[model samples]
Target: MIITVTLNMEKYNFLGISIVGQSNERGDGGIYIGSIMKGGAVAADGRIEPGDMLLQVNDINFENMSNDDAVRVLRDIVHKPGPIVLTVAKLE
Candidate 1:
């Protein structure tokens, strides 16, 4: 006999930093500071772009960390009591 089961899943809410623009020094390979989503508002006026890596947030360094770790950090920020401050390497 064959049995099948289905499970219901719920989406998790996350708030963090996102890239919208790149710098002109790293040759478009690094991330830079741009916009930040805070208090239901978008800062930097859409200056961030792609090709940028999120380096840090709220004094937490995320360099060389695994993908899973990065995700966990972001989620923590959204739920923690602090403003998100990201330090990214802007691309050129």
Candidate 2:
């Protein structure tokens, strides 16, 4: 089973999380967290793990997004004022 969790984080210059699975070579398993950079916004949120699925930014679903779309979406979110809200599904 996968458990979806909501994370509220402060705005930062960088979100600090690397994502994977937007585009695939040998099939795909959906978008997930690749890593969390030290001193980045995500690094401060210990609730997120590398095995978690990156599902949304605010309410925008990323399930069917492309690599370019992911980049653009995140850039847009990063520019938004106030805190960032993330929805992640944990690998259970």
Candidate 3:
């Protein structure tokens, strides 16, 4: 539990980022931003970092979720017309 940021998905056409789940080989995983679109919601907000580890999505802990599960949750969250609260840990 640390600094949490809520992003409004409705503000942009797309959330504009890619995420990946845990990877045993790398010993470094969990949902993380893989890329960001030029004029996407995240780009406009300018707070989320590429290396940040996503801890929760809309109050649901996404720590060990598979990539498919994470995507499903995201799809559901994006349709509600509310702020998507994402808890992330900044990586050093």
Candidate 4:
């Protein structure tokens, strides 16, 4: 947890970015952002960054989640409305 940031962006209602998935062959576990969305709310907001590690979205924890599991939640928040909140981990 080199860059230990408990980023719970209060204004992170709708994030725009690509949760690029690779090597689902799995790492130490946890889904890492593959790339930042070109024109979305992620790096668009400049708060969340590329290669950020996901901890949870709303009440979801991703420590044991697959890339697919994280993807569905990503879509859910995009369409599900309301203030979507999540926590992220960073390794530098």
Using TM-score as the measure, which candidate wins?
3
Name the regions of candidate 1 deviating beyond 4 angstroms. Answer: 1-45
TM-score of 4: 0.67
| TM-score of each model, paired residue for residue | 0.52, 0.76, 0.79, 0.67
Per-residue lDDT of model 4, residues 1-92, tens digit only: 52323322354444655564434344465677777755555654555677887776767676666677778877876576555555777756
Q: Of the candidates shown, which would achieve the greatest lDDT relative to the real structure?
A: 3
Clash pairs of candidate 3? none
* Residue pairs that clash (backbone atoms under 3 angstroms), model 4: 16-41
**By lDDT: ranked, best first:** 3, 2, 4, 1
The lDDT of each candidate is: 0.44, 0.72, 0.73, 0.61
RMSD of 3: 3.0
Q: Which digits, one per residue and each the tens of the lDDT, describe model 2 over residues 1-92?
A: 44444334454457888887763554455588888888777777677889788777777887777766886888898788765677777867
State residue 49's C-alpha deviation in candidate 2, in Å.
Answer: 1.0
Q: What is the lDDT of candidate 3?
A: 0.73
Question: Per-residue CA lDDT of candidate 3, range 25-90, in tens?
Answer: 444567777777888777777778887777777768767677788888877877777777777787
**Candidate 1, 4: how far from true, in Å?**
50
lDDT score for candidate 4 against the true structure: 0.61
